[PDB]
Amino acid sequence: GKLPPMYPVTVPILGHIIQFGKSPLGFMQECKRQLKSGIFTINIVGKRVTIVGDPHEHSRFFLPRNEVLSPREVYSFMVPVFGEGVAYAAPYPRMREQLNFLAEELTIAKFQNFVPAIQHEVRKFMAANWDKDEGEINLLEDCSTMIINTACQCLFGEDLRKRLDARRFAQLLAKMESSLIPAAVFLPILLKLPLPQSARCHEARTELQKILSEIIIARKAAAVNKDSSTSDLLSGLLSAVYRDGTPMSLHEVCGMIVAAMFAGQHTSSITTTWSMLHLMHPANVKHLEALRKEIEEFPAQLNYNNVMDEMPFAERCARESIRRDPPLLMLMRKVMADVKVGSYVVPKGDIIACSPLLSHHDEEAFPEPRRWDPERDEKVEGAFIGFGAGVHKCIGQKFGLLQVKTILATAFRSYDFQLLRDEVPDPDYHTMVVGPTASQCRVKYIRRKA
Numbered sequence: 001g002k003l004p005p006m007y008p009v010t011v012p013i014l015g016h017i018i019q020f021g022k023s024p025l026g027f028m029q030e031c032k033r034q035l036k037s038g039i040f041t042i043n044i045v046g047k048r049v050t051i052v053g054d055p056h057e058h059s060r061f062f063l064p065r066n067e068v069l070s071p072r073e074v075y076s077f078m079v080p081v082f083g084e085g086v087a088y089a090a091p092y093p094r095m096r097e098q099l100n101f102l103a104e105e106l107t108i109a110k111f112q113n114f115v116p117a118i119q120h121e122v123r124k125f126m127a128a129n130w131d132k133d134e135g136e137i138n139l140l141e142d143c144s145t146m147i148i149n150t151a152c153q154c155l156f157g158e159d160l161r162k163r164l165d166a167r168r169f170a171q172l173l174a175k176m177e178s179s180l181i182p183a184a185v186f187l188p189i190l191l192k193l194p195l196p197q198s199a200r201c202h203e204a205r206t207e208l209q210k211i212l213s214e215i216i217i218a219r220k221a222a223a224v225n226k227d228s229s230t231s232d233l234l235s236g237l238l239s240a241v242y243r244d245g246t247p248m249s250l251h252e253v254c255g256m257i258v259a260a261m262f263a264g265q266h267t268s269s270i271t272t273t274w275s276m277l278h279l280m281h282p283a284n285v286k287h288l289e290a291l292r293k294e295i296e297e298f299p300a301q302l303n304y305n306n307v308m309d310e311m312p313f314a315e316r317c318a319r320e321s322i323r324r325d326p327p328l329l330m331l332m333r334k335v336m337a338d339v340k341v342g343s344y345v346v347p348k349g350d351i352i353a354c355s356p357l358l359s360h361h362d363e364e365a366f367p368e369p370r371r372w373d374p375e376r377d378e379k380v381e382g383a384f385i386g387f388g389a390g391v392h393k394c395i396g397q398k399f400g401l402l403q404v405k406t407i408l409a410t411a412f413r414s415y416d417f418q419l420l421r422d423e424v425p426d427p428d429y430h431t432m433v434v435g436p437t438a439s440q441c442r443v444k445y446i447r448r449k450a
């Protein structure tokens, strides 16, 4: 049971961080075919990171349980945002109970009015910033706004949106996000040091909890006198009760709510943006025409069944945008026990990684991996890990693709788009969640005449 092959280090303390930083895909691709191995070890500032770049071996990463392959350590830099003691910072069963409640709230059973709520909100956007016959806009920005507005409309009741609208909420979320130092996965010390930024999320957190409390107290004042039939993500979570029979504290409720919105914000937008960029490119008229054929029968007011059931192709477009260019590049676990990966053994201490970026460009799994083709299929079973797998698979997946499909459907009905460059935009590897390079997403909308 040998250690996997490790790439020679040529920079004493830093290791491979510089090179891995400049060009992720390339670096890993070279490491792979340099060492003729899908499984291999690199070195981040002293730390050993074993990457599992062989899709046939994805199950050895996604199936071991928390006690052998743990997310706490590596995702503890998210504490300021979810809360101390919430999600990854909680006892694993408590962590698990928590995520289950969240999942219960985002299942397809709860999707009844989401689609009309999403359209109303999309149309509202389109009719205020896309209100000319032709226009230049930044599509990434604009899908981001659309995504957050639709999330809020699906997930929050009117009374909360009166106090906290999507605009306000994006700002509180940005404050929160500005204190994140993902660097601290490899330099833990940073999680314990106060920084210029540290205070910023706490201020937005306390403002957010303050609002939720006041909302709940008023909700109580009207249940004194009514059915108050409508429920939302908030009332959902407040009726949750742990196995031990105690309910969630406000701190935890709020943690789940931001964790929800935060998680979906960039990933769903980026996925929308990419899909449209691909669909509007000359080279992909074939696919744009196909999508539009799928939409052709549909009514103005879309419904649960149109987008849940009658849009296979729109889904393939979203999933393939993710496949070509996944928003999350490196997924990670801390190795609690020696564990067996293919012909190798990964020792206790290692950070173990599985990278959707790498696996989605395995030429066997995905012939011509830089070609965006919505009709392809994985040539290896399980090579698509865009939404993770096994114990920590994405729980927002369905809600996410609901937003994207409804947005594509609503957009491409009323409009055409004109990419303002020759080629589709390049990914930008220099942000924690990756998307098309923002400065390259300026785009022209054209209102359709029919």
Ligand code: HEM
Residues within 6 Å of the ligand: 099, 106, 259, 260, 261, 263, 264, 265, 267, 268, 271, 322, 327, 328, 331, 332, 385, 386, 387, 388, 389, 391, 392, 393, 394, 395, 396, 397, 399, 400, 401
């Ligand atoms: C296109 C949209 C999305 C993509 C590409 C995406 C991607 C992923 C991936 C790759 C994972 C696995 C993480 C890992 O294995 O370490 C994951 C997990 C997760 N995602 Fe998403 N996600 C999306 C949307 C959402 C949304 C809308 C939510 C919630 C509102 C959400 C909540 C989560 C949660 C809670 C997990 C936790 C898995 C766990 O630890 O049990 N995601 N997502």
Ligand SMILES: O=C(N[C@@H](Cc1c[nH]c2ccccc12)C(=O)Nc1ccncc1)c1ccc(-c2cccc(F)c2)cc1F
Residues within 6 Å of the ligand: 075, 078, 177, 178, 179, 180, 181, 182, 259, 262, 263, 264, 266, 267, 394, 396, 432, 433
């Ligand atoms: O790492 C980041 N975000 C993770 C968080 C995450 C990891 N495990 C998760 C499990 C559930 C939910 C969220 C996460 C994420 O979005 N993960 C996720 C997981 C599952 N589904 C969807 C999404 C992140 C890091 C830095 C920044 C940033 C941006 C601007 C300025 C700045 F200073 C920093 C933004 C980010 F967003």
